[model samples]
Target: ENSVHRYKKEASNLIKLATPVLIASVAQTGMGFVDTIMAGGVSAIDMAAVSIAASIWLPSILFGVGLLMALVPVVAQLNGAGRQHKIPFEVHQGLILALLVSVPIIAVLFQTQFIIRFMDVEEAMATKTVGYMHAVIFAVPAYLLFQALRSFTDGMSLTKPAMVIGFIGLLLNIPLNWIFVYGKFGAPELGGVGCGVATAIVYWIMLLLLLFYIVTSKRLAHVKVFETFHKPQPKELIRLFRLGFPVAAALFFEVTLFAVVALLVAPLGSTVVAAHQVALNFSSLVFMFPMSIGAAVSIRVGHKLGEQDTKGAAIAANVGLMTGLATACITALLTVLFREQIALLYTENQVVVALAMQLLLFAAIYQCMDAVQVVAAGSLRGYKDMTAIFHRTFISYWVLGLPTGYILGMTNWLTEQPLGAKGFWLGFIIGLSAAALMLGQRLYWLQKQSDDVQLHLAAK
Candidate 1:
């Protein structure tokens, strides 16, 4: 009875925190989907070009965002420990780091022409693909800045701000996309590139609004985020980098694995790539749920640890893990059952629809593993333990995931002929399942360690 009651309590807390975060996450992820949908409406070439551009754009931006994620646990701990003085200092450091990171990414994105060509992409896609990359590149810094501030707000238990800003970005994107894509409100029709440009605009809008809120909100005045700014400290900055870079690399590895697969599949033709985009986009939309839960779980674990309540932290982590699993099962069933219908929403092309339908099967199977892995990773982050994850992700994703995918997807090694899209997805399932297994074990060990500490303290 006690255990069940305790589980319900933790579950309620997880759901409460995760709901807004889930909505925000879905809103952010929907930007890509919206672009894909709009671009599809324009033409197949436009859709394919944007899909390829997205393969490039998502990794660069997510890598930087992952770096900023280090701030979440830091601020959460500081808040829980009542060390309010340290919050602003760390936030400033994050800002500096964001600046440093954005410059190179922007510079690289400007060379999108060369990058896409290097992928040996179709000539038809060359110009628009590069244009899309060039335009969205402008949004990188703004988005990172927003992410940095978001980390602070989220860590301090102020999730509504992020939710509101994300919705604003999504809402604003609708009009901007229409104006740019359709040449509405006096804007020139730019096709796929227009989608990119509108997203950049939305990024700045969200950042400025969030920044204004931080400065004006009495709720945050106590943190003094903007009263004065401190210059970056090399040592502190390095600490943040050391802690965060692995996370960035892990994220990069995962995003790039998918990106690389897209690149490899390019030679197969644009229709295949379009199908890939549809499958990837819908899965990402569903994934927002588990991702949100994981993030909330991270915050809960971090807060409990900060309060030095080891048992509470352990309970929170377990409850979150279970919550994620439950949700994954439901989504998996939905994906499998409605795969064809879902594909139809993306496009009327029968070939693309058929291909996307087949891929969703793999997507559905992996949902379970993906949910477990991300939440387990989040729990570890909450424990302030990322080294294991860094190593695990690199090995599982790069060494294991990508290689296995390449073999099955590109080679005749698996069957009579190459499995192509289906093969890569099978590899994806294998890789994610591997990550889930390792991360779950790591979480168990972490919980055991916390229990040992608690027992030792009790004995003393």
Candidate 2:
């Protein structure tokens, strides 16, 4: 009975922290959504170009973002321990790391034309995709720099600033899209390529604003977040990289898995690819709920662990898991009930709409599992148990999920005929289920270890 109250209290706290993060997350994804919609308004070729560009850009950019995520728990633990003095040094290293790493990534982004060429997309589509990459690739450094600031602020348990800034960026996105996309206000009609430029502008704006905020904010003044510019110390850089690489790898596998699926389904025909994309985009939006909750859960767990409040950390994780499941259940139900109506909003074509609606059913099934797995991963991250999370995610998604999808969708290994997109959705369901179960077990084992350690300390 007392435990119920504790769970409720912690759930309330988690909600407060997560709400803004959820808004920010949705707003971030909204940038892409807005770009897609505006591109579609130009022409089908423009829309396809935007999709192709995103397939390459999203995962590649998020790889760095994933690496920066290591900062969150690192900073949160320090803040919780009242060791704020240690933070700026870490932030300095993170900044250098963000800059140093972005160089090769941008170089690689410029080479995406090779990938589009290899895919055998229409020449016009390939051209636009490469152009968009050129315009947007400049934003990578700024975007990652912004992420570093965001991680620090998020780790400090200050989320409202991120929410506000994200909303500001979203507000800027539409106007810029109008100007650049339609050649409004005497701008060139860059079409989908303009979306990339607008996004680049947004990234710089957000980063500069965040930098300004960090320097001026009263709450962070004590941390001296920018008092000194430190060069890269190999030890700090290596530690950050080592701590974060597993997360980067896990996220790389996860993001590229979906991106790779888009590529794989391309040869299946435009209808199949379009349907797959619609379902994926909507699922990604719905996923923001769990993603935000998981992020908050990590912060809380890290903070509690730093405070050495083992029971409190458990309460936070449990509450966060429950919160994520509840939200997923609600969204899943809504998705099931209105899948057709939802699909119609994306397209008027009956075939695409019908196909998307069917895929959405599979999306609904995986929603809760996705929430559970992500929260479990976040909990483990709080404990600095990332390697296992990486292994499990990689094995589940790549070894199991991708192979299952290829067998079911491309080959007749599972049946006499290819099950097509439905087969891939089934693979997602199976893979996410595997991730949830395995990660949940991982969390349980970690919890048992914590309990054992606590008992030993008490006996001592």
Candidate 3:
């Protein structure tokens, strides 16, 4: 009875904490889906082109945003260390550095193939995609500035506001996509490029709206120390980078895996590439749940650690592990049960559907393992072990994930080889499993460490 009651207590608390984070994350992910679906409404070429654009765009975006993402843990740790008044300043620091890094990335993505080469892309498709990507690069600073802002809000546990802003962004993206894609209301009918244009507009709108609300509203007026708000200084920028670069590296380590996989799959023909995009895109949307739970776990555990409740932090993390496992299992099963219908959503090609089905099976298998890795990693981050996370991401994703994927993709020695997308996905499963085990072990080991080590972690 006591165990059941304790479990129920933890479950209830977990749900309460996770709900807003989950909603915000899903809304953010929906921003991606809205783009895909809008591009889909244009044509398969548009859809494929959008996928290809993302193959280049996401790695760069993650690189920019990942640096800001580092701010979440650092801020969380500072709060845990009882430096609550510094939160707004940390928030400022993250935004400033995000602005600085974003300009270069945006400038670089503008030249199209200057950043990455397309694989077997139709000449027409390539041109249209470049149009979209190039135009969107103009707004990269605006887009990533918003990302840093969102990260700060999330780190501060002010989640509902971010969720609200994300939905507003999604609402803005859909109509804007329609306008530019179809050239509604005098907008240029740029087709595939419209997706990028609409997204750019949405980024600015979301940022301005969120910034205005947070800075001017009565609610935000009551935050710990808004009166001390001033222009950022140079040293603070360095501090932000010192904190944020690892976050970016970790993001690059993970996002690169997908970007790399997309590149690998692209050579397999447009059909296979498009099919892989559909499956990967869906997996990412599903992945947002675990990702959110992981973030929520980090917050909850970090908060508990603030109170010196290490045992409570452990419970919070376990809640996340269970949540991730259950959610992933359901999504993984659904991937199989609805394979035929899902394949049809992204394309009408029978051959692509056939290829995608096999890929989806492997994708589904990987999700279970993927959940474990993300949840475990999130839990570790909750303990504020940022420097070690760099090693964890490097070794797990690049070391285990990439090499295995490349070997499977390139080696042609076997009679029954799972070449193409199938081989690529098998590598994903192996990588996720390795990441899961390593991260899980790390979390447990941290749990068992002495007080001094725990203090070092809280300081890290």
Candidate 4:
């Protein structure tokens, strides 16, 4: 027999499982909105300072976040297998590894402000930028630590805690920004540095609250945070780090691609960059849904795989793909239908809106493709196949994706005029399309080897 057990097979049911993840994902993204809205309010120079300051610490923060990807697959697998005793040690390991890794990253990033100064155009801009970076680096540890704890909890199939922590951070960020930016309550106005300081406070407070939930609440008591912390296991730490690198590479490469394009467009001028930010921020928020779906699939897939139900894992993986594609197609259609209205969120500039609208078309065209690739990557993460995933990303992103985008953005031979953001998005359309093809192919192959076909949706 291939399958026996099945729950309600409805869209609402799938969404029920996915809602917590969607909430958490959306909340995490709002952190950017919090910064952009607050930072932009602080004067053009201050806004630029916020932007420039991030270039220094962004890579480090990404690496720290990447490190936390380990918890999901591991936790998911254990949960599916109904293994509880093992969680405490792994959770402890995840936290320690996250903190240990985050420290050096912050230190290195903090020290790199000098390098940013050497790289920027004007010395004055560089000075302001580095000053902002100074306060921002302190949050890296707290942010990553929160991710580790969140990851460990998510692994156990209890996703609500992460969402709650994210909302807490979101709530705290607004008032903190007001205080830091406006010099509230007898504080000196720090300008761009204010954003950084506010973010740091948000990070620490969220982390403390999350830790409290795990230790005091009965809901997650099985994770055993109450016991004396175990001695750090270097082997387990290395195993997780190795497993997580693929997940990190996937995101890091994607972010790096955009960062390069941002810098490239910057030389063309500031107006272009500001307009670009408007469009980029909105698209990123929209990206949260597929990301949440993918994470949910990863958990389910990891659980089935750990239970040795390869067929069930395949079904769960495909279910995720179907959900991701369906959602993405709907978003694409709506984005195209309402491009101008969407563009209004950032600015009212005519030319910028025109360019953003065109860019939105390209974004619309490939939204489905992006959904497929991301969910495929997440499904494979459940399989614990990071080694191959890393190689695939390296080849796909650099060999095919980045170079294709560079040509589209830099060259005009293919078009009558420079396409700007539209051209860059065209590259994304191309790159993500390629990734979807390869990654989806891999999932198909995995399904063939699996035997859980009996658990097919028809069984419900």
| Highest lDDT model number | 2
Segments in model 2 whose C-alpha atoms lie over 4 Å from true places: 1-5, 35-74, 113-155, 183-189, 218-220, 225-233, 265-275, 387-389, 405-412, 415-420, 444-460
Candidates' C-alpha lDDT: 0.59, 0.60, 0.57, 0.56
Better of 2 and 4 by TM-score: 2
Q: Name the top TM-score candidate.
A: 2
414-433 per-residue lDDT for model 3 (tens digits): 33355545775676677777
Q: After superposition, how far is residue 117 of candidate 4 from its true place, in Å?
A: 3.8
Give me the runs in candidate 4 sitting further than 4 Å from their true place: 1-14, 35-40, 43-74, 118-155, 225-232, 265-275, 308-310, 387-394, 408-421, 448-460
**TM-score for each predicted model, relative to the true structure:** 0.80, 0.83, 0.79, 0.81
Clashing pairs in 1: none
Q: How far is candidate 3 from the true structure (C-alpha RMSD, Å)?
A: 4.6
User: Which clashing pairs does model 3 show?
Assistant: none
lDDT of 1 by residue, 1-460 (tens): 5557558757765876677778777776666556544553344455544454544464455454444444323335555545555666666666566666655565555555445444443323424443454445545544554554453234455566556667787788777766766646776554554555556667667667656666566455554444333443534455555545556556555566666766666566655644465556777777777877776776666555555555545566777778788888889887888888787755566666667777777787778778877777755453453543544554665557657755666444555333466766676677777777767666555445555334223211
Flag clash pairs in model 2: none
Error of 3 at 160 (Å): 0.7
